[PDB]
Amino acid sequence: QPPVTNLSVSVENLCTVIWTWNPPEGASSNCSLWYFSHFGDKQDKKIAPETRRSIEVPLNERICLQVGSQCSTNESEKPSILVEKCISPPEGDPESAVTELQCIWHNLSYMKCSWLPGRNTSPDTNYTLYYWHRSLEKIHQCENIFREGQYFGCSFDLTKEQHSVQIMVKDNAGKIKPSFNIVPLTSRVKPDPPHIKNLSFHNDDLYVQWENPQNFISRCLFYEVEVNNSQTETHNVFYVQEAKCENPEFERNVENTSCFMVPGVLPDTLNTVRIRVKTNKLCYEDDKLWSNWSQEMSIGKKR
Amino acid sequence: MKVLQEPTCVSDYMSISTCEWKMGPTNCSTELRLLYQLVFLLSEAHTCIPENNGGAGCVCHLLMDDVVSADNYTLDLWAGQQLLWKGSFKPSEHVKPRAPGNLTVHSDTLLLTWSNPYPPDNYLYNHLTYAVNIWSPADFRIYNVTYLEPSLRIAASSYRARVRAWAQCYNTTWSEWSPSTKW
Amino acid sequence: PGPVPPSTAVRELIEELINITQNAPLCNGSMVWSINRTAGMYCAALESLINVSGCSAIEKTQRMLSGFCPHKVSAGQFSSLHVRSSKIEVAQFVKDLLFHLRTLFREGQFN
Numbered sequence: 377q378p379p380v381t382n383l384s385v386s387v388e389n390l391c392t393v394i395w396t397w398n399p400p401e402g403a404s405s406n407c408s409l410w411y412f413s414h415f416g417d418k419q420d421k422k423i424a425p426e427t428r429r430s431i432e433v434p435l436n437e438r439i440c441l442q443v444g445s446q447c448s449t450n451e452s453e454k455p456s457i458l459v460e461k462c463i464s465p466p467e468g469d470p471e472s473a474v475t476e477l478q479c480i481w482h483n484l485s486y487m488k489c490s491w492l493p494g495r496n497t498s499p500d501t502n503y504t505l506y507y508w509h510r511s512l513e514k515i516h517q518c519e520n521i522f523r524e525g526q527y528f529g530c531s532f533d534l535t536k537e538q539h540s541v542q543i544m545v546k547d548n549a550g551k552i553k554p555s556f557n558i559v560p561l562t563s564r565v566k567p568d569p570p571h572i573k574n575l576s577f578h579n580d581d582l583y584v585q586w587e588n589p590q591n592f593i594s595r596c597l598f599y600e601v602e603v604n605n606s607q608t609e610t611h612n613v614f615y616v617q618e619a620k621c622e623n624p625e626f627e628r629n630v631e632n633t634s635c636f637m638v639p640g641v642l643p644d645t646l647n648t649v650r651i652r653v654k655t656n657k658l659c660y661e662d663d664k665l666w667s668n669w670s671q672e673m674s675i676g677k678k679r
Numbered sequence: 680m681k682v683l684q685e686p687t688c689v690s691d692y693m694s695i696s697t698c699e700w701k702m703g704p705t706n707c708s709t710e711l712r713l714l715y716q717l718v719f720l721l722s723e724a725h726t727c728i729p730e731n732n733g734g735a736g737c738v739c740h741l742l743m744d745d746v747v748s749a750d751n752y753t754l755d756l757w758a759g760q761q762l763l764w765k766g767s768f769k770p771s772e773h774v775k776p777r778a779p780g781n782l783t784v785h786s787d788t789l790l791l792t793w794s795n796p797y798p799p800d801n802y803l804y805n806h807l808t809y810a811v812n813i814w815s816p817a818d819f820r821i822y823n824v825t826y827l828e829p830s831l832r833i834a835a836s837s838y839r840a841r842v843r844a845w846a847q848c849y850n851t852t853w854s855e856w857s858p859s860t861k862w
Numbered sequence: 863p864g865p866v867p868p869s870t871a872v873r874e875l876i877e878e879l880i881n882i883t884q885n886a887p888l889c890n891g892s893m894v895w896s897i898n899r900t901a902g903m904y905c906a907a908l909e910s911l912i913n914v915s916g917c918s919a920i921e922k923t924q925r926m927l928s929g930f931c932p933h934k935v936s937a938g939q940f941s942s943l944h945v946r947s948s949k950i951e952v953a954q955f956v957k958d959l960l961f962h963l964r965t966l967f968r969e970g971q972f973n
């Protein structure tokens with residue numbers, strides 16, 4: 377019932393914001409104290425007996441946590457007194473924040489990040505990207521920087537309950553506003569291009585058999601098959617949910633291969649085939665990133 | 680008076696589940712009532728008035744709101760006032776997808792375009808395998824469609840086409856054949 | 863977690879949880895017990911979500927978890943069979959459940 381004591385804040389790693397408090401001085405000895413905590417506008421409510429709460433949030437906005445004490449875990453039980461402690465983003469020049477900061481995990485091997493300079497940016501500023509995940513001993517500074525045009529970037533290695541990777545872009549001079557980015561280990565994944573093993577015909581049906589990347593299994597991937605014809609000037613495209621090997625007559629016996637059949641295709645003309653691969657919502661969090669197209673494989677009568 | 684064949688129910692995984700059985704000759708619409716309810720808690724029974732197949736044969740149409748794989752339905756075939764047959768039914772185990780439609784032929788290349796009979800909300804909206812039969816009778820060539828877009832493009836090398844669907848993962852039976860299109 | 867789930871049943875539940883998180887607060891900020899271990903979460907998730915009364919959006923999800931749990935589940939069973947760690951919003955509950963299923967789908971425990 378009374379207010380909690382010593383509701384303070386701290387920042388571990390890069391984006392780990394931790395609220396910690398102490399039990400109320402006014403106390404009922406006949407009470408199992410549960411703490412009702414929520415953020416702005418009744419967001420992310422949680423009732424827990426712990427005197428601490430930590431979340432992973434990009435510190436780009438001032439967010440506050442309200443803390444109330446309870447004796448019951450019921451919904452009807454609403455604390456009369458709540459203490460709120462807020463935390464603001466680090467100091468820096470108004471429009472110095474780097475824009476369009478994105479990070480893509482390439483084939484579960486390396487993370488490549490890119491961003492654009494802020495509107496209010498000094499010409500002599502030097503960008504520095506820092507990353508961190510649970511497995512690391514401390515905050516690491518990505519040194520493999522790159523510059524693709526007007527874009528600034530940095531790519532670091534990253535090999536494979538819910539844990540994510542924190543990314544901070546900040547100048548060591550401490551003149552510009554540090555920008556943050558949280559990347560879940562199950563999202564922003566761009567696989568490698570697959571490898572076509574064989575193309576086989578059955579009347580007017582074309583069986584395409586390829587191989588997925590080594591770090592990805594069959595059921596975790598959404599497929600796209602491209603079939604370009606020379607004579608008919610056709611640029612067909614097929615989207616496949618899942619592709620399994622059905623007819624062994626027109627397929628190799630490699631057990632890591634997926635198979636798709638394209639109907640209404642003639643050997644009379646030359647047919648070029650490419651395969652593109654992305655992750656589905658069944659195994660990963662995002663299905664927006666396609667891999668690069670596979671190498672071309674042709675079949676049929678040449679011109 | 681006595682149930683000869685036990686009710687064989689099939690579902691289209693959306694709102695409807697067709698049950699069918701065989702009885703001597705009787706009036707199922709008058710005497711027989713099919714009571715069905717979901718095993719899910721807060722049980723609410725439902726009464727079905729079965730239509731007649733013909734010659735000691737009746738067919739009942741069960742109505743649902745949504746269908747998930749875990750759904751299990753207990754069946755109670757009430758003969759007048761006395762229970763004739765008791766059993767259960769699982770829609771996901773015996774799925775029969777509803778037939779596709781709106782098939783239109785063609786024209787640079789011969790093209791066929793039909794429609795997905797399921798709404799985007801449904802689960803089969805992305806898990807339906809099609810099969811187009813194009814004949815003139817043994818001149819037919821069957822095509823298998825396992826990609827998303829319900830399109831079929833072939834070359835020209837007096838015909839009639841038809842389309843049916845099949846859900847791969849649920850190991851269903853083939854859907855009924857769509858109304859053919861002559862050209 | 864529980865009995866070996868069919869591939870279709872997992873893919874369906876996963877797809878449903880994703881469909882829910884696409885919008886307005888889920889179940890108007892109703893709160894349920896969170897899950898600690900994946901040793902028996904298939905019944906723990908159901909025993910937790912069953913305490914939600916007036917939410918229609920979670921109804922399809924609740925009906926799916928019934929096939930993943932061997933025994934029968936009624937309202938108010940979580941406290942006795944599982945450790946009460948913390949209560950969270952249904953939205954957070956679904957996201958955590960979705961993550962556990964997606965992890966299970968990669969490991970391929972189904973069937």
Ligand SMILES: *[C@@H]1O[C@H](CO)[C@@H](O)[C@H](O)[C@H]1NC(C)=O
Pocket residue numbers: 718751752753767768769
């Ligand atoms: C459905 O529930 C009944 C009773 O609860 C049970 O006997 C049956 O095995 C379940 N499954 C099917 C497929 O009927």
Ligand SMILES: *[C@@H]1O[C@H](CO)[C@@H](O)[C@H](O)[C@H]1NC(C)=O
Pocket residue numbers: 810821822823
């Ligand atoms: C098409 O798929 C069905 C169902 O698996 C199969 O029985 C049939 O042989 C297939 N036909 C062709 C030409 O691929």
